[PDB]
Symmetry: C3
Subunit: 184 residues, 3 copies
Amino acid sequence: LYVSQGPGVDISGDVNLTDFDKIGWPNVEAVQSYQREFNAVSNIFDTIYPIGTIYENAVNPNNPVTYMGFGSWKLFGQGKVLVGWNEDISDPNFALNNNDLDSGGNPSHTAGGTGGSTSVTLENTNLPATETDEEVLIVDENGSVIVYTKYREAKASTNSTHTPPTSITNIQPYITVYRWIRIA
Amino acid sequence: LYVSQGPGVDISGDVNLTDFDKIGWPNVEAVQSYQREFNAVSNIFDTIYPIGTIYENAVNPNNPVTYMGFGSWKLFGQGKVLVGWNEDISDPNFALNNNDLDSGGNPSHTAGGTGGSTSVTLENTNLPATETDEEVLIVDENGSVIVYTKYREAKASTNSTHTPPTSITNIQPYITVYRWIRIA
Amino acid sequence: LYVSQGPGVDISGDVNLTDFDKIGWPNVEAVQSYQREFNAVSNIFDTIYPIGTIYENAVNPNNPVTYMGFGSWKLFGQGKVLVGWNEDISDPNFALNNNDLDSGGNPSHTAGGTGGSTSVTLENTNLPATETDEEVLIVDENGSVIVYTKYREAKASTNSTHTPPTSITNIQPYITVYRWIRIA
Ligand SMILES: O=[P-]([O-])[O-]
Ligand SMILES: [Br-]
């Protein structure tokens, strides 16, 4: 026996891209509602992998059309992890899209925000207060202690040659995959 | 010609949710084995996107039912990266689910554990041993050195006003996407 | 009415694995072009979830064949985040595959590279230059200052017992999921 088309479905929330070079908001448009009938496999494919879908393959380097048969696809998020967009606008990282600013420079509440860093290089502002393990002689106008080499009165450096210091990884355990977006 | 239904399949490993507010273990139940016949497109959809499936779209903000036609969907992992659950129980981060504790407080060996942080603020306990670049005069009961301003004998602070210091990012390069779970 | 098979598709970019134990390049082979006709649901499944596809389920612990009906599947990227492979070979982390080296030790430009760390432990090389908040007496052959306890002339330690210091998390906010690769 054969697969029934079933009742068609009202596709009311589709989108299309309006830029295929730089991908994402603001260059996305809503598609007016239309009926999808499952006339053929291509229509099923469109219901499974609508425009914007992210697809990942661990090993196949080729464009997905060559091994799926359908869709137009582009590499997506190269060098990036995916973070879930947050509907809570107070999220300071994952709600507001720095790549889609309004005329006042204000980011939209859309997916496609980017950020993060592969390493960090510590600066003095990042260091907590510390003290020497032992007492030393400290210059003090309110002090009570009266004082082969001579000495100088100066702030004592530590790590003066670390300009800059060695960076530290900021990357958690990963594996890379071929990641694609369906663009049309 | 038409797509054959094929031999049906024995779906022996399906699950359903028993809480749609707080999602995940422990509120998941096994479904007794049943036969799936591919009578219509909806049945194909259920084989591709079974309950629990994670779906991601870079650009479409809408609920996937509105552009797929099928399923019930909820945003998932907002503000989070996905980590692969580890079948090796000795993984200290990614095996045991802190959100699903037994009566003794012990986490289950299930997916849905959460953790991680967007930043770190260094504390003194995180700092390695250091020393001054030059010699200074250090108080020492076993010492041999006899000793406009006076001085005081005290531990010398560094960065005393860094209470707290500036935090450091803990986020690696990302892009946000609309991420969903099929809940029914 | 019934779903049409449609015109078949030329699958020119499929791959197969040649090792199911250790997964990935170099043990991947190209499949010569073949025609896929959508004779049955299984053929549709192969177009949606070709070999190498990554599938994620938040809650279902079982092997996907038991709840999809099709494919052979293995857990993938346990304990890992997925990063998009970079077609730009200059990416120092996410382009070149450390798990697939040539005879000179040079990594291939393929997905499957791994790296990253769950924590960092700071070392002295990572620290920026600092100085004491106040002036102290510093040994100086070019100095002009002539100098209950005695003293010693020595470099003053800080945090001498931090051998090693407390590690710091390197994990950004996450949730774990059951992640699988279709291996056949
Ligand atoms: O304050 P840090 O130089 O040990
Ligand atoms: Br990190």
